[PDB]
Amino acid sequence: EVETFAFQAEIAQLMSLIINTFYSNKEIFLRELISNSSDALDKIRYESLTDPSKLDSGKELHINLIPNKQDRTLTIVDTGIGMTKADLINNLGTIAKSGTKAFMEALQAGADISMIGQFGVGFYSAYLVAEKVTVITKHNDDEQYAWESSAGGSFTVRTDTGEPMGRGTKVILHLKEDQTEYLEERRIKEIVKKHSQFIGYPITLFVE
Ligand SMILES: O=C(c1ccc(O)cc1)c1cc(Cl)ccc1O
């Protein structure tokens, strides 16, 4: 059972801007996704301080970066709070309508695409390098779901039954053919060191 949804007009507009605007500094997508993972890990950490049972679904708080050259995918995995089906559908827990408006107003006032994260819509920078994005998530209060979108104005949501993840979110980036540099170990290391060197959770770069 696959449900298909239309993006709200402002988000479709944001995604089209990200896909069609000439902007060479695409590497910021990884900083934005690691920042989202760090925010999700802060949330489960904070909840766990008053209710330790919130960590029954996994005590380790970390981020993994998994390149796969054969599948042309870069996966970002975290053991953060995860998202309910309701929050997945509601723009992956973001204030994407108001955030898109504020980002649009900033771009007209001198901002550049790298400042996207300041407006709470950093997730959508995945579309600088991915033709398709799959988001697998598990929140303590709901079941495991898979969100997917190749942009074009719609996304799908389905229950995910293969590979239970305990708790957290997995962002699978199906890379564009000219963006395979982001599967190279030395390139990922360089971007992590440049933009995410002080993230408060261990970041493990997997090898092949
Ligand atoms: O699960 C979350 C999430 C949940 C709540 C939250 O406030 C922030 C991010 C998640 C969302 C994205 Cl899009 C990427 C990584 C993630 O860890």
Curated annotation (Swiss-Prot):
Binding site for ATP: 36, 78, 97, 123
Superkingdom of the organism of origin: Eukaryota
Post-translational events: ISGylated.
Localization (cell): Nucleus; Cytoplasm; Melanosome; Cell membrane
Region (Interaction with NR3C1): 1-208
Sites of N6-acetyllysine modification: 43, 69
Disulfide bonds: none
Family membership noted in the UniProt record: Belongs to the heat shock protein 90 family.
Known role: Molecular chaperone that promotes the maturation, structural maintenance and proper regulation of specific target proteins involved for instance in cell cycle control and signal transduction. Undergoes a functional cycle that is linked to its ATPase activity which is essential for its chaperone activity. This cycle probably induces conformational changes in the client proteins, thereby causing their activation. Interacts dynamically with various co-chaperones that modulate its substrate recognition, ATPase cycle and chaperone function.
Domain notes: The TPR repeat-binding motif mediates interaction with TPR repeat-containing proteins like the co-chaperone STUB1.
Subunit organization: Homodimer. Identified in NR3C1/GCR steroid receptor-chaperone complexes formed at least by NR3C1, HSP90AA1 and a variety of proteins containing TPR repeats such as FKBP4, FKBP5, PPID, PPP5C or STIP1. Forms a complex containing HSP90AA1, TSC1 and TSC2; TSC1 is required to recruit TCS2 to the complex. The closed form interacts (via the middle domain and TPR repeat-binding motif) with co-chaperone TSC1 (via C-terminus). Interacts with TOM34. Interacts with TERT; the interaction, together with PTGES3, is required for correct assembly and stabilization of the TERT holoenzyme complex. (Microbial infection) Interacts with herpes simplex virus 1 protein US11; this interaction inhibits TBK1-induced interferon production.
Name the UniProt record assigns to this protein: Heat shock protein HSP 90-alpha
Organism: Homo sapiens
Gene name for this UniProt entry: HSP90AA1
Residues of the full protein shown: 16 to 223 of 732
